[PDB]
């Protein structure tokens, strides 16, 4: 569970309409801190976490100026892509892209990566060694060669290794308060008899990494335990639960226990 920075971008062409829609956004861990939309009245990079408002105007002018140059490429990228796969100018299409650095034991990065997908399916990814690319098919194979002739994976290693880690830290410190302080869950359990079922709640926690577990009479029983998708609360926190139907008789003999780096607490009805 190391800290991560991710920039996520998507281009969807709206044929018949105007220029393709472009949304870019950044995440430190599970927290969106910045966003772009060509659809917004004034398309321009802008803050989505208090700790980033702190950055100066020239920082914004440059981030915005840069992502604004991203959209142009992806506009051009969409056509290129539609011509590789020999595709009529009539269907809507989506090109998405992501780039990230993951933090090692000390400062320096643990994993860096950049990748692309076209219409849902994978396309072009930067290799672990940050020095090569895996293409999904003949189409992406063309991009690989372009990248290769353009010596480009250095420029990309550069960022991932330097800039990325660097700013990851800057934002981490400037947001120690929220990025580095874990919210522990306010857990409990609830009843609800059908026959009877037993639900184990975990609310208001950060980050969204949590495991949930119910114990029968001894250890792990996970054959009918309900596995609800971990959801945003709406404030910076998250929410989840696991639940079981038990024969209405031995109820406090079941214990749901949960770990979260914010020791592994254990709880019951």
């Amino acid at each position: 569970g190391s800290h991560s920075m991710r920039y996520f971008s998507a281009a969807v062409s709206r044929p018949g309409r105007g220029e393709p829609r472009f949304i870019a956004m950044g995440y430190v861990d599970d927290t969106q801190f910045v966003r772009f939309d060509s659809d917004s009245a004034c398309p321009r990079m802008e803050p989505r976490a208090p700790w980033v408002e702190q950055e100066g105007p020239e920082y914004w002018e440059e981030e915005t100026r840069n992502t604004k140059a991203h959209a142009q490429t992806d506009r051009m990228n969409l056509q290129t892509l539609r011509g590789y796969y020999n595709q009529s100018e009539a269907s809507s299409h989506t090109l998405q892209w992501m780039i990230g650095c993951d933090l090692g034991s000390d400062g320096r990065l643990l994993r860096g990566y950049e990748q692309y997908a076209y219409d849902g399916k994978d396309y072009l990814a930067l290799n672990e060694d940050l020095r090569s690319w895996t293409a999904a098919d003949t189409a992406a194979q063309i991009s690989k060669r372009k990248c290769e002739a353009a010596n480009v994976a250095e420029q990309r290693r550069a960022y991932l290794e330097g800039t990325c880690v660097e700013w990851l830290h800057r934002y981490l410190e400037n947001g120690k308060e929220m990025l580095q302080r874990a919210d522990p869950p306010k857990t409990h359990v609830t009843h609800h008899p059908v026959f009877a079922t037993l639900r184990c709640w975990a609310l208001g926690f950060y980050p969204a990494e949590i495991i949930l577990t119910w114990q029968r009479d001894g250890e792990d029983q996970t054959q009918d335990v309900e596995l609800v998708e971990t959801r945003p609360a709406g404030d910076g926190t998250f929410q989840k639960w696991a639940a079981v139907v038990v024969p209405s008789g031995e109820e406090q003999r079941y214990t749901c226990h949960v770990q979260h780096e914010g020791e592994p607490l254990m709880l019951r009805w």
Partner: peptide, 9 residues
């Protein structure tokens, strides 16, 4: 901070 250039497929 976002990466300046974007690459052309």
């Amino acid at each position: 901070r976002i990466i300046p250039r974007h690459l052309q497929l």
